[PDB]
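INPUT
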Amino acid sequence: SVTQPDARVTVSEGASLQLRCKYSYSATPYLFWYVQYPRQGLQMLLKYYSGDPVVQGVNGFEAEFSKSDSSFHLRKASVHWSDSAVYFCAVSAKGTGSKLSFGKGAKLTVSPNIQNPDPAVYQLRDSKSSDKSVCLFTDFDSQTNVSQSKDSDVYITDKCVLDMRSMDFKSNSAVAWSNKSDFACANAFNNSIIPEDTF
Amino acid sequence: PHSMRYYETATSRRGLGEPRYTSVGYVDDKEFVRFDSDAENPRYEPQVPWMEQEGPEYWERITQIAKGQEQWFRVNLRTLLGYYNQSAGGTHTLQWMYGCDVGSDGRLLRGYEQFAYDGCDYIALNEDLRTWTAADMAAQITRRKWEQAGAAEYYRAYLEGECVEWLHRYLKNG
Amino acid sequence: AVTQSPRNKVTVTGGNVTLSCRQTNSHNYMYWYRQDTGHGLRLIHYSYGAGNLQIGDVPDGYKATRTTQEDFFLLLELASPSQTSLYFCASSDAPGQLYFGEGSKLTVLEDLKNVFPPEVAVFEPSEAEISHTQKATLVCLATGFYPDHVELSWWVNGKEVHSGVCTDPQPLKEQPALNDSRYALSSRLRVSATFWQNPRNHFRCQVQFYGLSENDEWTQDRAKPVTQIVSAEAWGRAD
Amino acid sequence: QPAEGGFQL
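OUTPUT
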C-alpha cells in the first residue's frame, strides 16, 4: 500500500513544492505519480522502473526515489495557480506490474498572490422579486480564513479564486445568505475579518 | 559462471484458429519449467524433481502470467501482421528470449532481452541495458516508441531484479 | 482516447446499472476504478485482454465483462448507496502507464421522495462594487436540491464561459447535522463594469440536474423531480 | 520467475 502523509496542502504561488510518498513493499515496486485536475480524469505525471533515481517528468515535475527510505518524493521548483489539483502516488508490485495501487491523494491548493488587496462586503439583490439579498465578501487576501456558518440556517461558502484572463486579475470570494427576517452585511462574515473593508 | 533463460514463442494457426503459445525455461542449460497452449490443461509444469516442492500459489501466479503472455503475444502478432502489410492467409511466428548471465561473484554479468520475428532478428536490447539495436524499417518504430515509453529500464528492472534472485533461489535447490 | 458512458447517472437501490468503456487505439489492459473520500481511488476490476477478467481490491457488488479488446463493461446488478461514487475506466499498453476516462458519477438512492430539483437564482452586481472596483459581480445560487449531483455552467449571450467564474468545488449541506439533507451551490461570474452596464448583454446561469429517469416510479403531490435543466437569467443594466 | 511482456509494439 502507498502512504501519503497529508490529504490537504496549501502553498503560496511561486514557491517550492515537495509532496511525499512512502510505500510498504520490501521488494522495490514500479513507482508512479499522477495528477487529477478538477472535473478531469487522472494523467500520468511520471514513472520509475529502474536506473537513475532522479526521474524527470513533464511540466517541470521531478521525483526522487530513495531505496534507503523506501521513498518516492515529488518535487517542483515553483508552483503556479494552474498547478492546483489532487496528486496521487501509485505503485505496482513486481509480477503484478499492470496492477496499480493509488494513495489517498494530496489536494494541492496554491494560494495566488495579489498585488493590490482591497477587501469588501457588498449586498446583491435578486434579478426578479427584489428584497432577496445575498451578502458577498470579496477582494480580500488568501491569508485571511473564511469561517463556516455557526448558524445552520445561515449559509456561508468557502473561499473561491476566480480568474479574469484578460486583465490578469485573480480574486478570492465568499458568499453568505439567509432566508430569515434579520440578516445584514456586518451581521454575517464576522469571524476573523479585516476592519478595513468597504460597507 | 551460471545462467538463466526463457524462450517464449507464438505461432499463428492456419485457416481460422487461435495461435499456439509456448514458454520453456532453462537454468544452466537445463529445462526446469515448461508451458504449452494446445495442451489439455494449459498450465506450467516442473521438468525436474527439485522444483516440485514449490507451493501452489507460485504455480497459479506464473500460470496467470502465462495467460497474460498469451494475450500479449496475440496482440503483438496482430500488430506485426499489420506492420509488414501481410494478409491473414498465412502462418507466421514470434519469439522472445529473455535471460541473464551471472559471474563467479554472484552478481549479474550480462542481461539478455531479444525479440525475433519469422526467423529474422527484429529488435534486441544492448549490453548497456539502456539502448536498442534494430535492423529493418518496422523495428525502428518499436525502438522509438520504447525510447519514449522507457522499455529498456523496465526490462532492466526485471533483469537486474527478479531474474538474479530467482536464479540463485533455484541454484540453492541443486 | 478513452470514452466511458454515461457521464452521470442516478438510480435506486436494487436497480440495474452498466458502465461502458471504449478505447479507440486498441490497448490491451483495461481498468475499472472508483474514487472515494479518504480512500483515494480503489481498483474494482481489470482485464488483460478480450474475454478475460481479473479481481481488484474491491470486487464485491460489481461484476465485469470484457467482450472485445476495445470494449470493457462494469455491471452492477444489486444497487446500494454504498456504491454511490465516481467511476473511472482506464487503458494501458504499458504496466503502470494508464489512460484514464472522462469519469462517471453515479448516485444510488434508498428513497425517491427525498429527490428535489434545484431552485436557481441570479443576483445582480452591487452598485458599490461597480463604483469602487470598476467591476461587476453576478452570483448564481442553486438551492434545495437532492441528491448532490448537479453541474453548473455560465452562459453569456447563449455561449458558455469559463473566464472570471468561481463555482464552489462542492455544494453545502442546508442541514449539516442531517445526512441526507438537501444541498446548496453558489457560483460567481465577474466581468468588467462596462460589460454589465451594456444592456444589450445577456447573462444566464444554468444548472444541469440529474434526478429521476423516465423509467422511474412516481406517485406524489409534488411535480416529478426528473433530470432537468433549471436556469436563471438577467440582462445588462446601465443604471 | 517468468516475466510479463507488458509492452506492445
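end of record. DSSP finds no helices and no strands in chain D.
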